[PDB]
From Swiss-Prot:
Identification of the protein by name: Multifunctional virulence effector protein DrrA
Name of the coding gene: drrA
GO MF annotations in UniProt: AMPylase activity; ATP binding; guanyl-nucleotide exchange factor activity; phosphatidylinositol-4-phosphate binding; protein guanylyltransferase activity; small GTPase binding
Keywords: ATP-binding, Guanine-nucleotide releasing factor, Host cytoplasmic vesicle, Host membrane, Lipid-binding, Membrane, Multifunctional enzyme, Nucleotide-binding, Nucleotidyltransferase, Secreted, Transferase, Virulence
GO BP terms in the entry: protein adenylylation; protein guanylylation; regulation of GTPase activity
Broad EC category: transferase
Lineage, broadest ranks: Bacteria, Pseudomonadati, Pseudomonadota, Gammaproteobacteria, Legionellales
Function as written in the Swiss-Prot or TrEMBL entry: Virulence effector that plays a key role in hijacking the host vesicular trafficking by recruiting the small guanosine triphosphatase (GTPase) Rab1 to the cytosolic face of the Legionella-containing vacuole (LCVs). Acts as a GDP-GTP exchange factor (GEF) for the small GTPase Rab1 (RAB1A, RAB1B or RAB1C), thereby converting Rab1 to an active GTP-bound state, leading to the incorporation of Rab1 into LCVs. Also shows RabGDI displacement factor (GDF) activity; however, this probably represents a passive activity following the GEF activity.
Span within the parent record: 317 to 640 of 647
Record has Ligase as a keyword: no
Catalyzed reaction equations: L-tyrosyl-[protein] + ATP = O-(5'-adenylyl)-L-tyrosyl-[protein] + diphosphate; L-threonyl-[protein] + ATP = 3-O-(5'-adenylyl)-L-threonyl-[protein] + diphosphate; L-tyrosyl-[protein] + GTP = O-(5'-guanylyl)-L-tyrosyl-[protein] + diphosphate
């Protein structure tokens, strides 16, 4: 065999061989990982091709997350993609997204809050470009289809759609739960699409907003955080034993605002038909729900009229079903 090779030399040649083995296993997982990332990139190009904004968006994120987890740069994966191509139809979208993202980014920076929201819209724009730089060589320029053109509105919804699905259920913009607020702006934009009333002016307006008007952020005309309106049957906390802490020194009107708001939030965690059906069921079955459904004035109660709070809580559900039945 190696017969006669000294003890020392056996050790040395045993170490120098260790080195090559690492260099080998490396060259393998590198080839392994790149081949993998090459797939993730295609998934995203697929979505992008068949116009699914809210999807190419999520797909591109998968790629990015992997890439970043395996210390890989666009330059690493580009050589492997010399086989594929991005349709001029895809670059068309890609550019429209960059625009939308870029503007929504600038508008989101309001005097109220101008850190998280703008910061997130960028998070997206930045990592969208990532998917594109994994293909487009740094010296080349994008070749879009001047003919093709998507609706700024359809793209915006998509971005918000995405930000909502990836933000944390504790992620907050200004005083609101990001999830809730993104869901609120999606509905707001859609309403404009339905009334063919989408222009630079109405849009910059929704994008610029942080729902600083409870009155209109919850659709509960009497929303407030103080005294409010009178009664004869103010909404009190007791009488029920299943009302979590917070709702205590909460008196009537202001209390319905509070519950209403928390519902809006919990309700924004729905990802589908069944998911929502439950969150609503699980909500109706609470005791703070009955605090909403209980009147506050003789008239409204000696008739059993659907209160305003419930009136509103039913709308919030509707806009959510809608904000879901479009994701499809």
């Amino acid at each position: 065999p190696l017969g006669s090779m000294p003890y020392s030399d056996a050790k040395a040649m045993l170490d120098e061989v260790a080195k090559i083995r690492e260099l080998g296993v490396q060259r393998v997982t590198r080839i392994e990982n790149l081949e993998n990332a090459k797939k993730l990139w295609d998934n995203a190009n697929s979505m992008l091709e068949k116009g699914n904004i809210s999807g190419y968006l999520k797909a591109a994120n998968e790629l990015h997350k992997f890439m970043k987890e395996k210390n890989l740069k666009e330059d690493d994966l580009r050589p492997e993609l010399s086989d594929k191509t991005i349709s001029p139809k895809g670059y068309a979208i890609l550019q429209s997204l960059w625009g939308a993202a870029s503007d929504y980014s600038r508008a989101a920076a309001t005097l109220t809050e101008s850190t998280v929201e703008p910061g997130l819209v960028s998070a997206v724009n930045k990592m969208s470009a990532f998917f594109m730089d994994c293909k487009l060589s740094p010296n080349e320029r994008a070749t879009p289809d001047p003919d093709f053109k998507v609706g700024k509105s359809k793209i915006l919804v998509g971005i918000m759609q995405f930000i909502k699905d990836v933000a944390d259920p504790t992620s907050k913009i200004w005083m609101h739960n990001t999830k809730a607020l993104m869901n609120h702006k999606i509905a707001a934009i859609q309403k404009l699409e339905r009334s063919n009333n989408v222009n630079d002016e109405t849009l910059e307006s929704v994008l610029s907003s942080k729902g600083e008007n409870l009155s209109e952020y919850l659709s509960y005309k009497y929303a407030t955080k103080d005294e409010g309106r009178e009664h004869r049957y103010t909404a009190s906390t007791e009488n029920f034993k299943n009302v979590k802490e917070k709702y205590q020194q909460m008196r009537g009107d202001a209390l319905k605002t509070e519950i209403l708001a928390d519902f809006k939030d919990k309700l924004a965690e729905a990802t589908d038909e069944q998911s929502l059906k439950q969150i609503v069921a699980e909500l109706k079955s609470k005791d703070e729900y009955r605090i909403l459904a209980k009147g506050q004035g003789l008239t409204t109660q000696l008739l059993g009229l659907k209160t305003s709070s419930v009136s509103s809580f039913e709308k919030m559900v509707e806009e959510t079903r809608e904000s879901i039945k479009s994701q499809e």
